[PDB]
Amino acid sequence: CLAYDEAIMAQQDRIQQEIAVQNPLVATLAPFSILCAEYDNETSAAFLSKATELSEVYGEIRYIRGDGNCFYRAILVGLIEIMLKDRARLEKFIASSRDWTRTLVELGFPDWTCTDFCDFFIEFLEKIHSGVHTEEAVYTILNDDGSANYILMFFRLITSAFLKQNSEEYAPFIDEGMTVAQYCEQEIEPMWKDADHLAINSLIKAAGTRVRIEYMDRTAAPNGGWHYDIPSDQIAPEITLLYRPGHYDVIYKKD
Amino acid sequence: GMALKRIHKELNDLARDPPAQCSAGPVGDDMFHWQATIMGPNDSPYQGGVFFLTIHFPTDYPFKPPKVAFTTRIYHPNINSNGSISLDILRSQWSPALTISKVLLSICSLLCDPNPDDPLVPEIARIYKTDREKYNRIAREWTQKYAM
Amino acid sequence: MQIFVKTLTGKTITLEVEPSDTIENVKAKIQDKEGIPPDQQRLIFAGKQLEDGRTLSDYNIQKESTLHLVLRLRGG
Amino acid sequence: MQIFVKTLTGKTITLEVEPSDTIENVKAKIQDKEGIPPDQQRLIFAGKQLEDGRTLSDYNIQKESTLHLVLRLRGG
Ligand SMILES: [Mg+2]
D32 C-alpha vs ligand 1 centroid, how far in Å? Predict the structure, then answer.
């Protein structure tokens, strides 16, 4: 039955619509108290405890839509936020993105579609650099699905490329019956696919950034909570993310 | 918007470098609906046939797959009587890096080599597997009747 | 506690669960009522795909919560 | 016996284990060396995830076998 597979596709689309009405792709900043207000001592004491402790270090959270793309989206928001504060970094990232573009063709990615995503993202960055895009305009672009998802595809693509560059190292870490080639084509390149540690490691290293993940689960933790730095090697992290089971948001230190 | 811009690029590339056996494009003012044709492969029981298909691009293309169905009836384990096509690229394994050209190539390829894993039309799959002489006869008969 | 599981057709299945029940446990429970193998079930709550090894509490699923049951694509 | 656990940071962790040790026991040993709680660990051998209640002998893990460790970081 294919009314079967088509009916599932239609259902998946309706579920995504349901989430989209409730939450933007990229929220405005909220104070950390809002995260704490999701929890209470009567029904979610462990999560409340984690959130209250994190409030000592973090002042704001930026909610990212849970549409399967949240890790890639949190990272690109993080990167673009650095580039808005650091013009030299922006200029360098433009030159390096042009390198990723030639690197994709060299590795045999589909020619024109992959270059189309690269060019769109590069033009977007060039227009921030030239001042054609204001900060307000940038957040509007990141919330407009068509342009936002074009940009996000660049990040999916470099994630895939880095894995393929390093396939021998990374092959044994895959646990779902796939080669690195198959994993890329099924789990990294398509939209709406969750990121696991393998994909997370790849994106961060491919983008040349440094991330701290605050691991907010229910597990009793040493003072300050569980967290992980990627790469793990004593530079301060450039991006800080909040991980709760199944989802990533972006968070911001008080100082 | 971005979907329309992408669809224009898909059309340009296909006009300039079409997949073997395949043609396609908009039927009217709406860029989101195309018609396509596939010539039955040679050395197949579809030889001599011309098979029509309908392509509908979603409003969030290329982030969701195009919808593609045969409008010409065809005898095949993985293509049903409504023209629905059982092909991973169209559903589970769509990615925005793929194009309508690659979809058409994949459909062609499927006509020459049916997928035996969980077939859309089990009866026809059995006949393909166990009685190729009969499968070829019926496929040729339907080609003559619907695709000529 | 009571949670609801909404299927493809709109049909709502009511389940009785503990917060510490694993998602795998919840899928076995759904198998008991609809006869759908757990290997074919995906559960979704608030955008999140629910992991077999995790608990309902891990996702802050409360009383009267509604999860989506989405079956896996068969292909072919 | 000795076994090796490769990580995505490129570090190899060496562990002292018995065939009768559970996967849970192995994760506790990784915590002693690396500080990752067992509930945040995923261990892989022969390209599949290992279950906590099973032993190293159940999975044919033996002298000088190599496992791969990732963190439970799946998210959308
Ligand atoms: Mg210990």
Answer: 5
